[PDB]
Amino acid sequence: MAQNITARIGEPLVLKCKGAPKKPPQRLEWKLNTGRTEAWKVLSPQGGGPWDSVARVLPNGSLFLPAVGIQDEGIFRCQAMNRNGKETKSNYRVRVYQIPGKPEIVDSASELTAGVPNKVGTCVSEGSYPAGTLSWHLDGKPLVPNEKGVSVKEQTRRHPETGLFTLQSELMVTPARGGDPRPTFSCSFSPGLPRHRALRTAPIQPRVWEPVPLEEVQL
Ligand SMILES: [Zn+2]
Ligand SMILES: [Zn+2]
Ligand SMILES: [Zn+2]
Ligand SMILES: [Zn+2]
Numbered sequence: 001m002a003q004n005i006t007a008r009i010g011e012p013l014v015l016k017c018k019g020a021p022k023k024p025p026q027r028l029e030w031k032l033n034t035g036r037t038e039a040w041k042v043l044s045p046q047g048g049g050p051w052d053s054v055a056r057v058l059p060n061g062s063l064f065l066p067a068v069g070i071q072d073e074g075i076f077r078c079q080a081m082n083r084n085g086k087e088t089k090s091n092y093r094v095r096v097y098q099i100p101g102k103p104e105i106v107d108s109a110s111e112l113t114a115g116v117p118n119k120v121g122t123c124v125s126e127g128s129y130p131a132g133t134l135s136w137h138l139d140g141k142p143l144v145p146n147e148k149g150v151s152v153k154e155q156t157r158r159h160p161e162t163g164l165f166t167l168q169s170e171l172m173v174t175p176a177r178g179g180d181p182r183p184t185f186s187c188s189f190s191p192g193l194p195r196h197r198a199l200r201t202a203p204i205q206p207r208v209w210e211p212v213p214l215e216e217v218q219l
Contacts, residue, residue: 002075002091006194009098009129013065017078019088020061027081028061034094035071068096070129070163097193098164100127103134105187108204113211114179117149120171121204123187127164130192131156134169137186149174181208 007013020028030043032055047057053066061080065072078090108121123134134154136143145152155168169187184205188198 002093005076005092005094007068007072007094007096009069009096010067013063013068013072013094014058015063015076015078015092015094016090017057017061017063017080018090019082020078020080021083022060024059026061028057029079030055030057030063031077031079032075034074034076068094070096072096095193096129097191098127098129099191099196100125100132100164100189100199102199103187103189103201105185105201105204109206112173112175112183112206112208114175114177114208115210117151117172117174120173120185120206122168122170123201125165125167125189125199128167128189128191129164131158131165131167132192133190134167135188135190136169136171137184137188138173139180139184143171149176175208177210179208179210182206183208 005013005015017028017030020026024045026045028045032041032043043055043057043063045057045061049056051066056064058064063076063078073094073096076092076094080088082088103123103125105121105123107119109118112118112120123136125132125134136152143150151172153170157166159166171185182205184203186203187201190198
């Protein structure tokens with residue numbers, strides 16, 4: 001019954017109060033349950049204020065947020081007396097997002113040694129909401145973090161001062177012998193919200209070194 005609204009952090013949002021008369025006077029009230037304050041907050045025509053933000057009731061009865069943020073996630077309800085005579089209800093659920101910058105691979109290896117585990121590099125994404133995920137490719141094909149000789153260590157960290165996230169994914173591989181000598185790797189960031197294109201790193205191409213042994217004793 002509650003309509004889902006998706007809004008990008010930073011951007012304005014207008015929510016319609018269904019059945020409100022087009023202009024004042026209006027009998028309507030907005031009630032909001034959002035962010036980290038537990039109590040419903042009540043707004044009515046005015047409506048009023050800020051600036052610089054936040055929520056105001058417009059002349060047409062709509063709710064206006066000048067720049068949406070994480071603290072605006074939650075429930076937005078309107079009740080309005082129709083023109084005339086009975087009441088119309090509106091009920092929205094608002095979620096928000098931020099697309100982070102292009103992902104980057106830090107500390108990439110120039111060379112890998114076949115037959116032992118190697119740190120390929122760490123993929124970092126900065127500034128997403130909600131967190132979303134990172135994943136790797138080897139020559140354009142998906143790496144599963146659990147398959148033979150691939151392992152991934154991942155970190156999600158939330159900035160307590162902005163609510164945005166930093167993701168890290170450190171790829172470790174153990175190359176089999178012969179063995180393409182110049183494999184390519186890259187990482188993609190997949191947003192949690194919205195239904196959005198992944199963001200991909202520039203590829204790295206370490207060389208695979210195979211040290212040749214003839215150095216063990218017949219016991
Ligand atoms: Zn409580
Ligand atoms: Zn580094
Ligand atoms: Zn892929
Ligand atoms: Zn986009």
